Enzyme design. Structure first.
Site, PDB file in Angstrom:
ATOM      1  N   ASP A 183     -20.921 -41.501  30.757  1.00 43.51           N
ATOM      2  CA  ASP A 183     -21.401 -41.291  29.409  1.00 43.51           C
ATOM      3  C   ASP A 183     -22.909 -41.542  29.400  1.00 43.51           C
ATOM      4  O   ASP A 183     -23.445 -42.257  30.253  1.00 43.51           O
ATOM      5  CB  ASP A 183     -20.659 -42.217  28.441  1.00 43.51           C
ATOM      6  CG  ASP A 183     -21.155 -42.100  26.999  1.00 43.51           C
ATOM      7  OD1 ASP A 183     -21.248 -40.964  26.470  1.00 43.51           O
ATOM      8  OD2 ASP A 183     -21.443 -43.156  26.391  1.00 43.51           O
ATOM      9  N   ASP A 196     -25.152 -41.994  26.165  1.00 44.51           N
ATOM     10  CA  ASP A 196     -25.632 -42.909  25.131  1.00 44.51           C
ATOM     11  C   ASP A 196     -24.975 -44.276  25.264  1.00 44.51           C
ATOM     12  O   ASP A 196     -23.746 -44.384  25.317  1.00 44.51           O
ATOM     13  CB  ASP A 196     -25.362 -42.321  23.750  1.00 44.51           C
ATOM     14  CG  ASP A 196     -26.180 -41.077  23.487  1.00 44.51           C
ATOM     15  OD1 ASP A 196     -27.338 -41.214  23.039  1.00 44.51           O
ATOM     16  OD2 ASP A 196     -25.671 -39.960  23.728  1.00 44.51           O
ATOM     17  N   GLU A 247     -28.939 -44.893  21.359  1.00 45.36           N
ATOM     18  CA  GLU A 247     -28.220 -43.702  20.907  1.00 45.36           C
ATOM     19  C   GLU A 247     -29.237 -42.637  20.512  1.00 45.36           C
ATOM     20  O   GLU A 247     -29.991 -42.822  19.555  1.00 45.36           O
ATOM     21  CB  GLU A 247     -27.290 -44.039  19.741  1.00 45.36           C
ATOM     22  CG  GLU A 247     -26.168 -45.036  20.086  1.00 45.36           C
ATOM     23  CD  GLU A 247     -24.988 -44.353  20.796  1.00 45.36           C
ATOM     24  OE1 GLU A 247     -24.635 -43.206  20.420  1.00 45.36           O
ATOM     25  OE2 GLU A 247     -24.426 -44.952  21.741  1.00 45.36           O
ATOM     26  N   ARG A 263     -23.633 -36.671  11.219  1.00 46.33           N
ATOM     27  CA  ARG A 263     -24.841 -37.287  11.740  1.00 46.33           C
ATOM     28  C   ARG A 263     -25.912 -36.250  12.037  1.00 46.33           C
ATOM     29  O   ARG A 263     -27.086 -36.459  11.709  1.00 46.33           O
ATOM     30  CB  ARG A 263     -24.509 -38.122  12.977  1.00 46.33           C
ATOM     31  CG  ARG A 263     -23.968 -39.483  12.602  1.00 46.33           C
ATOM     32  CD  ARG A 263     -23.546 -40.266  13.806  1.00 46.33           C
ATOM     33  NE  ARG A 263     -22.295 -39.789  14.380  1.00 46.33           N
ATOM     34  CZ  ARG A 263     -22.080 -39.707  15.684  1.00 46.33           C
ATOM     35  NH1 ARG A 263     -23.029 -40.015  16.547  1.00 46.33           N
ATOM     36  NH2 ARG A 263     -20.892 -39.299  16.128  1.00 46.33           N
ATOM     37  N   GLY A 288     -21.353 -36.344  24.188  1.00 48.10           N
ATOM     38  CA  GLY A 288     -21.356 -35.706  22.877  1.00 48.10           C
ATOM     39  C   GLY A 288     -22.747 -35.361  22.368  1.00 48.10           C
ATOM     40  O   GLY A 288     -22.866 -34.614  21.388  1.00 48.10           O
ATOM     41  N   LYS A 298     -14.197 -34.602  26.652  1.00 49.54           N
ATOM     42  CA  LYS A 298     -14.851 -35.307  27.748  1.00 49.54           C
ATOM     43  C   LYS A 298     -13.935 -35.391  28.961  1.00 49.54           C
ATOM     44  O   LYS A 298     -14.378 -35.169  30.095  1.00 49.54           O
ATOM     45  CB  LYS A 298     -15.291 -36.695  27.301  1.00 49.54           C
ATOM     46  CG  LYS A 298     -16.627 -36.696  26.571  1.00 49.54           C
ATOM     47  CD  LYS A 298     -17.070 -38.101  26.215  1.00 49.54           C
ATOM     48  CE  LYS A 298     -18.565 -38.108  25.903  1.00 49.54           C
ATOM     49  NZ  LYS A 298     -19.183 -39.430  26.180  1.00 49.54           N
ATOM     50  N   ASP A 310     -18.634 -46.299  27.069  1.00 45.62           N
ATOM     51  CA  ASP A 310     -18.763 -47.435  26.150  1.00 45.62           C
ATOM     52  C   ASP A 310     -18.015 -47.291  24.830  1.00 45.62           C
ATOM     53  O   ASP A 310     -17.716 -48.319  24.207  1.00 45.62           O
ATOM     54  CB  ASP A 310     -20.240 -47.697  25.830  1.00 45.62           C
ATOM     55  CG  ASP A 310     -20.894 -46.520  25.131  1.00 45.62           C
ATOM     56  OD1 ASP A 310     -20.670 -45.367  25.559  1.00 45.62           O
ATOM     57  OD2 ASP A 310     -21.628 -46.718  24.143  1.00 45.62           O
ATOM     58  N   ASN A 313     -15.138 -42.696  21.994  1.00 47.79           N
ATOM     59  CA  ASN A 313     -15.479 -41.346  22.399  1.00 47.79           C
ATOM     60  C   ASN A 313     -15.047 -41.070  23.835  1.00 47.79           C
ATOM     61  O   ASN A 313     -14.766 -39.923  24.198  1.00 47.79           O
ATOM     62  CB  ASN A 313     -16.998 -41.177  22.229  1.00 47.79           C
ATOM     63  CG  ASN A 313     -17.437 -39.749  22.297  1.00 47.79           C
ATOM     64  OD1 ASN A 313     -18.561 -39.458  22.728  1.00 47.79           O
ATOM     65  ND2 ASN A 313     -16.556 -38.830  21.891  1.00 47.79           N
TER      66      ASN A 313
HETATM   67  C1  LIG Z   1     -21.296 -40.358  19.094  1.00 45.37           C
HETATM   68  C2  LIG Z   1     -22.344 -41.221  18.860  1.00 45.37           C
HETATM   69  C3  LIG Z   1     -23.614 -40.863  19.291  1.00 45.37           C
HETATM   70  C4  LIG Z   1     -23.818 -39.670  19.951  1.00 45.37           C
HETATM   71  C5  LIG Z   1     -25.063 -39.332  20.407  1.00 45.37           C
HETATM   72  C6  LIG Z   1     -26.168 -40.114  20.352  1.00 45.37           C
HETATM   73  N1  LIG Z   1     -27.134 -39.436  20.924  1.00 45.37           N
HETATM   74  C7  LIG Z   1     -26.650 -38.257  21.340  1.00 45.37           C
HETATM   75  N2  LIG Z   1     -25.355 -38.212  21.018  1.00 45.37           N
HETATM   76  C8  LIG Z   1     -22.783 -38.817  20.201  1.00 45.37           C
HETATM   77  C9  LIG Z   1     -21.530 -39.176  19.766  1.00 45.37           C
HETATM   78 MG   LIG Z   2     -22.023 -44.077  24.478  1.00 45.57          MG
END
Ligand SMILES: c1ccc(-c2cnc[nH]2)cc1
Ligand SMILES: [Mg+2]
Ligand SMILES: c1ccc(-c2cnc[nH]2)cc1
Ligand SMILES: c1ccc(-c2cnc[nH]2)cc1
Ligand SMILES: c1ccc(-c2cnc[nH]2)cc1
Ligand SMILES: [Cl-]
Ligand SMILES: [Cl-]
Ligand SMILES: [Mg+2]
Lengths: 396, 396
Positions: free
Chosen positions: A183, A185, A192, A228, A272, A316, A339, A342
């Site tokens: 992963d 982030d 993130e 988001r 993601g 994933k 982490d 997800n």
């Molecule tokens: C869930 C949380 C954050 C993210 C993300 C943060 N930066 C890119 N993707 C993707 C999925």
């Molecule tokens: Mg992560």
């Protein structure tokens, strides 16, 4: 070679003991079945199973020659006709890694008693690291079908005592791991990215709150990503490069990747997040495979949407499989590190799924959990020691 | 964690010692820096470097608690403020495999003294096989630049004593081997196919004599193959399938290949022989890469020629490189196994070149020589033990 005799030499390490013993034995008709020797903190143990003529084994010359040679210089030796003893020990079934900062005596004692209570034999204990954390390995022999109980017992010890405790199958197959995915982030990369994009919109607070709810399994991933990314509607596309250049690798990430290239792993990332940010980096890190989402752009401006299809929890895992098939690696030989919830599906399908400073939803499903902020503790779970990493790195 | 104390427990293995020790230490303010423990032939050694408050280390409570607990049940313990001692030993630099049937005491003693005379420390000795041959491993720490002398010294011991002795770099990189190629004739397969074809022509005697001269470096390979295949002029092409169905794998070849698939090796063959015979088998053995020569056929009949280009000594190395590039494996991570001067160049370019029951020209150039008629002794040189192979095989 009629009968088998066991010679055991113990005491304070000294030059010449190994050589002296076998020279003495060569004055008798001795052939070797098995030799084990180690020196721990200047304590030598040398165990030798041999076979010789029933004539020599039944008479006192072999014994007096051995005893006089070994005792003369300071050590002790025993000699006994065996005939019934194992020739060569069986391999361990499993291995246990204990990482702590610190590892207290109480922590280790709890592991040892947990192990014992299940009838698990400790075959070896060694150190694998003195930095960035103390790491200890126990190779063990688990009664068949007890290893579910063992993982359960040790996970409690782990939380009760503030050490990571990982139980891993120690067979030839399952430990020839060849492929790892991270992963991005909060795993390979600090923080993130979507929070760093939202900061450009003054939306960081909202995005970060949705992210933590999403990374705890509290929200459906797909909905949480649309909400988001929407907060990015109107930002110019230039903001991608900007955040790209701000990113910081998790500490020990370069060591992790470099060491894993030395071992011939295929290395990739499943995110993601957004291909336009991860690709610049995956290439910088010489990765073999990137899977990510894609931001929609119109007239050089973000629309606040992603271009499907969306990599969700299930996606994933699907990228891992896809990566493993392309690389020619069976899934039992793959490693996933993440982490958030997800990553739950990706860790389940991987041979070894590692939860790195993870939310409880992930810790509850991972094969192994790491609690310290150094990504190179992954290397210890893959059978690599600190000293080996430093040797390799020093050789350049 | 002010000062470092070293606790060392030795004696006859018993249940509960590991657990007892760390429970006692937990009544004092003890954190673990390093734990080494092994049991060899019921002799336990437990070495523990810890750090604790200078208060506890300077007072007699910790000592009386440890000494009373360990001595009560039968073992011995020492306790000493260290502060100057290494925390965790460095890795071995090299590893030495000793294969014999038998391994005499004199053989092993010669190795041990050879090692000592060069200032090489033995860090570990273990058994890796009790069948089909006795195999013993010494992990060692070679003074820098001494390892040429060490290989030289041990090759003499090897011939003088009738044991194989292989010295191998024990670094992270050099021991992540991922790709192996076998010569076919007299390596993967018993005997020489071209001799089995010539028998169909009543030319076996002549072909076999040219083959032995070619496999000793006495003749140029290309000329020797043309002379030999010429004796096949006039045989019908059907003779290929015939010989194909007669072939016998070297003993232990299936175990070798199966075990190497478990470890994720790419496996191939490089032969001066004939693709029409080797392909039927490579496919049966699930190989990844075949390189071979091609017999010329006219009207369903052999013409006694091969269809160039001819894989000669240099061409076998060239196929290895080609194979390594296609598989994504650096050459230092490749293994070649062969028997004739035909294979000299292929063994030199490989990371590890193994001479299997080979002619002196090959033995003189190989990184390692095997003298017993079991191809699975290759597995021992690649860090695999008999017990591990049997575990994996029993699990199916
Ligand atoms: C869930 C949380 C954050 C993210 C993300 C943060 N930066 C890119 N993707 C993707 C999925
Ligand atoms: Mg992560
Ligand atoms: C047999 C039984 C127990 C043990 C042991 C496990 N942990 C310490 N000693 C070693 C051999
Ligand atoms: C230090 C010096 C020598 C040795 C040794 C090598 N072989 C047996 N003991 C072990 C430690
Ligand atoms: C040298 C000697 C023998 C061979 C051979 C035997 N069978 C096929 N090729 C090839 C080269
Ligand atoms: Cl993107
Ligand atoms: Cl052919
Ligand atoms: Mg050959």
């Amino acid at each position: 070679p009629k009968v088998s005799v066991l010679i055991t030499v113990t005491g304070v390490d000294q030059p010449g003991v190994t050589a002296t013993l076998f020279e003495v034995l060569s004055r008798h008709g001795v052939e070797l079945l098995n030799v084990e020797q180690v020196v721990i903190r200047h304590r030598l143990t040398l165990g030798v199973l041999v076979c010789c003529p029933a004539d020599v084994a039944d008479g006192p010359a072999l014994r007096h020659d051995v005893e006089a040679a070994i005792r003369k210089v300071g050590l002790d030796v025993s000699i006994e006709r065996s005939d019934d003893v194992p020739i060569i020990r069986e391999p361990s079934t499993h291995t246990i890694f204990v990482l702590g900062r610190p590892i207290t005596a109480a922590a280790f004692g709890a592991v040892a008693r947990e192990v014992a209570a299940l009838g698990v034999n400790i075959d070896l204990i060694r150190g694998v690291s003195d930095y960035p954390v103390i790491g200890l390995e126990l190779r063990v022999s688990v009664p068949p079908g007890a290893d579910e109980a063992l993982r359960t017992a040790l996970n409690r010890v782990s939380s009760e005592e503030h050490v990571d405790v990982a139980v891993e199958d120690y067979t030839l197959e399952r430990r020839a791991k060849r492929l790892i995915v991270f992963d991005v982030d909060s795993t390979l990369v600090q923080g993130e990215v979507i929070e760093m994009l939202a900061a450009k919109a003054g939306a960081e607070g909202q995005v970060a709150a949705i992210t933590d709810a999403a990374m705890r399994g509290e929200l459906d991933f797909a909905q949480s990503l649309q909400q988001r990314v929407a907060t990015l509607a109107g930002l110019p596309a230039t903001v991608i490069d900007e955040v790209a250049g701000q990113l910081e690798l998790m500490p020990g990430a370069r060591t992790t990747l470099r060491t894993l290239r030395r071992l011939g792993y295929a290395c990739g990332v499943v995110s993601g997040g957004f291909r336009r940010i991860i690709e610049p980096l995956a290439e910088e890190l010489m990765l073999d495979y990137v899977a990510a989402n894609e931001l929609e752009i119109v007239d050089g401006t973000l629309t606040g949407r992603v271009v499907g299809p969306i990599i969700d929890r299930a996606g994933k895992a699907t990228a891992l499989r896809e990566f493993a098939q392309r690389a020619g690696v069976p899934m039992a030989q793959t490693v996933a590190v993440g982490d958030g919830a997800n990553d739950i599906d990706m860790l389940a399908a991987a041979g070894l799924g590692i939860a790195f400073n993870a939310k409880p939803a992930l810790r509850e499903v991972a094969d192994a959990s790491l609690s310290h902020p150094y990504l190179d503790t992954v290397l210890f779970l893959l059978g690599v020691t600190r000293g080996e990493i430093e040797a390799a790195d020093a050789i350049d």
